[PDB]
Nucleic acid binder design. Sequence first.
RNA 1: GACAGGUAAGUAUAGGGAACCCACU
Lengths: 63, 115, 50, 67, 1131, 101, 46
Amino acid sequence: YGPIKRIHMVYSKRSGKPRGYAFIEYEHERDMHSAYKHADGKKIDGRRVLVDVERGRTVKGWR
Amino acid sequence: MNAPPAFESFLLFEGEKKITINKDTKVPNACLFTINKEDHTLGNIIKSQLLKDPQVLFAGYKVPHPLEHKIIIRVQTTPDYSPQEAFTNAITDLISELSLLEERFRVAIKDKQEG
Amino acid sequence: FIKDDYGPESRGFVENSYLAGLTPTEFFFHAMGGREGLIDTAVKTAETGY
Amino acid sequence: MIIPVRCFTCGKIVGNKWEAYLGLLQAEYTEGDALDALGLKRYCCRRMLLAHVDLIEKLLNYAPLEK
Amino acid sequence: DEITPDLWQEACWIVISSYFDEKGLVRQQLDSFDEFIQMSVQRIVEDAPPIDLQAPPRYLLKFEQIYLSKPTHWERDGAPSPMMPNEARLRNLTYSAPLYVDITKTVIKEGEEQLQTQHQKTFIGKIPIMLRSTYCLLNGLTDRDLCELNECPLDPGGYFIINGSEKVLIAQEKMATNTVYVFAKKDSKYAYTGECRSCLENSSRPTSTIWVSMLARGAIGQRIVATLPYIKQEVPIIIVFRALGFVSDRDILEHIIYDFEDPEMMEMVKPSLDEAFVIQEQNVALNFIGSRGAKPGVTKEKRIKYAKEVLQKEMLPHVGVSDFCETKKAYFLGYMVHRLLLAALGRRELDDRDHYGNKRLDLAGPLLAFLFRGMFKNLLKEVRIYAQKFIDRGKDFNLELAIKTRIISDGLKYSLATGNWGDQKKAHQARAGVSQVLNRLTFASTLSHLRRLNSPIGRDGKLAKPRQLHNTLWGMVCPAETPEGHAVGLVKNLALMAYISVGSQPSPILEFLEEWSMENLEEISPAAIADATKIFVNGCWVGIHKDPEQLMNTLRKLRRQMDIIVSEVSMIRDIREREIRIYTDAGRICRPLLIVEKQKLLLKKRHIDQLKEREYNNYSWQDLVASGVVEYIDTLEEETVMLAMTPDDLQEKEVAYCSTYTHCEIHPSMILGVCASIIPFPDHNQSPRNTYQSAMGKQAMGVYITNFHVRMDTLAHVLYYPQKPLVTTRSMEYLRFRELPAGINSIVAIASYTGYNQEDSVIMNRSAVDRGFFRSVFYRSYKEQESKKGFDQEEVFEKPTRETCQGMRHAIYDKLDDDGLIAPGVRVSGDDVIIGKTVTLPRYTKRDCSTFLRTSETGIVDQVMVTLNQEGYKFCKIRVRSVRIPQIGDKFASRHGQKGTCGIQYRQEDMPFTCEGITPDIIINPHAIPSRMTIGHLIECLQGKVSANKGEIGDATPFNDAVNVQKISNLLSDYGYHLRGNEVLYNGFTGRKITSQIFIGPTYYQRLKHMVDDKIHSRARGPIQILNRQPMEGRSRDGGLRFGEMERDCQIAHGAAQFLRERLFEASDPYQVHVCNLCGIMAIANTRTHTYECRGCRNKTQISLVRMPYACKLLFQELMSMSIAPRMMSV
Amino acid sequence: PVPPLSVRPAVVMQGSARNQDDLTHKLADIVKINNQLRRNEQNGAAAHVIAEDVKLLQFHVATMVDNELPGLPRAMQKSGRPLKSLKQRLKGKEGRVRGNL
Amino acid sequence: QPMIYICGECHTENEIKSRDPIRCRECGYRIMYKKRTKRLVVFDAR
RNA sequence: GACAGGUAAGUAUAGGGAACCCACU
Ligand SMILES: [Zn+2]
Ligand SMILES: [Zn+2]
Ligand SMILES: [Zn+2]
């Protein structure tokens, strides 16, 4: 969907196991918006995955 | 696509004579035995036995074509003797050879087994 | 080879038999000869056809 | 791709020898020693073992068309 | 510290191992493409002049920088997708990445009001991406990653994928640009001709070729005249100089000659002065040139302006194009004239056109750069037109709408698909051949194809001179590998260690020279030239020097230290002349060589050990190059290099031959190429047999790629039981023949047996064939797609039924499924529908367009794949596999130019046998060897027996003194065998010993793709061509054989008139016509009503039936179209 | 003269769009020029444009007979692929005479 | 009628109908393969 | 209304071309 400036895979603090969700930072905001609609529902390694803009620091009152 | 079936080598096709006899008009007491679905094994053993036979002025075999599985055996005997009789006696003697060799081999195998 | 060398080896004389094998220079020169032959064939074919 | 079942020339079974040959090789036997241990006297069978290239592992490196 | 010879063998081979680990085999392709993408695209974009328009409002529209994404693919929803290279192969996509640029449009209308706006990442097209290149998505992927992606790790890449077809760019030879070559052409009106194909670093303008000829003797003397670009006449050289602004003959001779003490030169040039005397003024000369111009301008002013433009821009562009470059241009022209004079007087040898050092190899880099330059010019022109047309009405425009990415994208796709290197409309004018379909028959074939070279001379040429192998090709090109057909000698291959420079900027070199004592050309005076040493950089004479020896020492030190001069750069000092030429051009071939100082290699045991431990310490070939033990050398530098086979030459001798060596071969065997390398003991064969093997290897069947199981390649062959040869050259370790062998080691007896192997035929063991000997599988991929081009007419896959669809053959469609597709694991015969397809008509409303299995073919459906093509249409590929058991007529070949067809197969009991049960897998007539000189074949058989008995792999590296026939024979005897390999064999039929003792042993054989089943063909009244009713062509169409002209002539000689008549008339295209007896023209014959009429004569009774060939009827009709009356007098 | 369809056969395509012969296309061009000139004659037109139409018609007919006259431009079917004149059909090897008779 | 195809990427079975655009319902991957036929198949071991 | 079972009536079980390239004898 666009070049990725940085990729972050979250891990368990104590167990170290993979959390199962990551944050991807694209070079351009448009590449992200282009991915918002298409990425949702993708299948990676046989398991369906969902994709939505991270609202943790965008949507007011999100937790 | 044109490869002949393997069994064709030894399986007589429907209505095939296993053996056919002709008289070689060139010289007397001479017969040609055309044997189908046979090869150098039988040809050579029979030729050797007939050559051993003294009355046989002529005995031999050939394969007209390797791609074909037919052999021709030419046998000429003395006037007082028949190529057919010579052929039959040669086969009989080879059969006796095989029987004797079989029983002797059985004895030897047994004896080796005991020690 | 040194410059201005007109010796057999320098100018491409194969002093070794096929069984003995060929030193690299001799092998190269023999390849040149074979190439000459092949080219002659590939051209004479058309010339003679015409 | 896989070790042939029979020696092409003589027909001696060799298909049941590839794993043992590899085991000996990793056991540090020379190739000739391994062949002798397996009993491959005729150089036809010795060829069958020496020249073989087991491509089947490289083939298996790929995932199957079906899960 | 040193390396004793015993150690030296292993040391050199370790060095080669490290080299190949570092570089790979298609390094030249990958590097050329990477350099292209990285530098050349941006260079072209910047060089492109900004477009300004006037309706008043004026626009700038300047391009700034390029940004290239990775290969991406969009569906209908707009979702970009990562096209697996495998995905592109499967779906017939094109592996290309979108390209982008930054554009700045500034508008000025009045009051210098700047409207500078910038549009960033403007999409402008797509660029196909060479696989495994830097920018390919497979770059730097681990072998595990490639296996996951279904990509053979051993696959070298170096090719593009256009619509799912693999394409490879063949390097194209050409005369090196920016050089002075003097050729003697007595055939022409010129005794000699200097020539320079000047060409700036990067320029849409093609190379400007300038000639300077000396007229053949016979008014009084001989005159020198130059032919310039855009001028249809030669010009006196003195006139050219005066136009450049040099009237003083003293100055002109200072520029041309450098030692005025040479009355020879000076007298020889006098006649040119005599010819060109009246014109004494630069303006007069410029007017003269303008008049000589193609379209001289009536005005003398405009003539002079045109001439000045031509001189400044079109003449010696690489020297300069800007004003004030007149001094440099004059000096270079004088140097060219000086070269011509030297050649004319014989003081300097003529340059050899075929001398390979005078050639350059346009790899994928330069070729794509040229194509992209043209295409970018077209895009800029189109944008200019669009913007101009909109601004003409005062209204503005959108640069985004102006841009037509299709220009670039479609042009690149078309060029790389059709190989026609040029504009699509100029197909004929372009040169085809480039961008061939990658040959995937085997790994060896693929490698050779990727390393292929082509000479653009043209196959029609009958001149053996260019075709001949040349001395310069040593170590640069494989001397053996070359097509034996009409293209012999024209198509080549790279030697293993060969490598092609990608080029580099000479700016750092020029800066270093300026820092150095080098003196600028303009700065110096003419006098100093005579004794000084000229310095050229890519043909640009920059200046002179006074201590060339130490200067060259400094340059070599710098290159070895890798400080300012990259390895690719070449430096040559023509000591006999006074020139030092430095080349950083791309396309200059080059090979590594071990450096020698005094009489000792710079390589050392410590280097060897570090290389041995390369895995851990990470020491590498690059580290060797940096340390400066090894050095790259091109052909021009080779001309001066003095080189040694091996350290043995360095070893002191009673009569030192050279004692002044400078380099040493890494190993002589490296001079061979990919295909030639697999040959064991090539140095024991007649060279033409090595040449033949170079191609038969390409044909051998094996495992062409590890991941074949997924690739739906159009045609493929896979051997059941490949085997690495028992006898191996060390070089195949890097060809990876071990990983992907193509052939089987087979016990071969070189004996006469039943005569069925005579004349290059071979008997084969039927029992071995049954046991799987040389059994193979042949995969054929069919493809189809359902097109919805029009609502009126559309195609669909389905299982059609006779009641609905009409165009059905009698073939059964039951094998198909409800989707009009056959399923895997289904037996299939020829002319058997496999893809039931139908089309909606404008037995009703449906016409059959199904795809049947190729006639006479058979097999089982390996697998089926269904996708959507670029336009969403359903698109199905079916791979069908047929098991080919070797049989009579199938082609086999050793590695020694010995090929033959299987004459007959004898079961094991029939085959002859040793005292042991061993029987030969193959028997080959001894009559091959005598004339063929394939002694390498026999040696291979012997050493193969030795190695098989010993439990090792024989080493048949060509130039290996440690191995010889006597040693091999002694070893063989040690294993209880006859020392020469002979054996006592028994006739299989009778058991009797054979009076002779048969040579027998293992030998690597390989089964070539050409099988009798794919060539057998016959016809009896099949389909016929439409234009003429003669039999169709080609067995795929059930065609008929061509009874050609020489066959006609042979029958004529036989006198078989009736047979000739049958062959040419009654069996080809019998026809009947009616002819007016009066005018002798075909007449209208309604046979139903028996109404025969000739309009011209208006008669009806005097008409005669005439039997003639339909081709003859067509010829007569065509003549009458040409308005000829081939009247037909039956009387 | 106008050769019949058999001489310049049109092939029914996999798509419904029939594909016309090279001679057919050349004849179409000639007919177009002929009709244009006939119109420019039946209605008064500048002698210059009449001459230009005559020149173009001459070129088209000459190319139809032979599409290889040196100097002249080559008749170009589409996408820059030259036509095949009758002279080329009959010219040499692979022609009607040597290739088919 | 069912027409089960195996997706290339996820190797998942899925029905496909005629005129249905080819795309794995599971992963949106556009490459599929027909499943091995059920017809009786035999091979003499020659 | 839906859905599961049975009876009756009707339907369904003619062929390309060119160009180019590669390879072959
Ligand atoms: Zn064996
Ligand atoms: Zn008439
Ligand atoms: Zn899927």
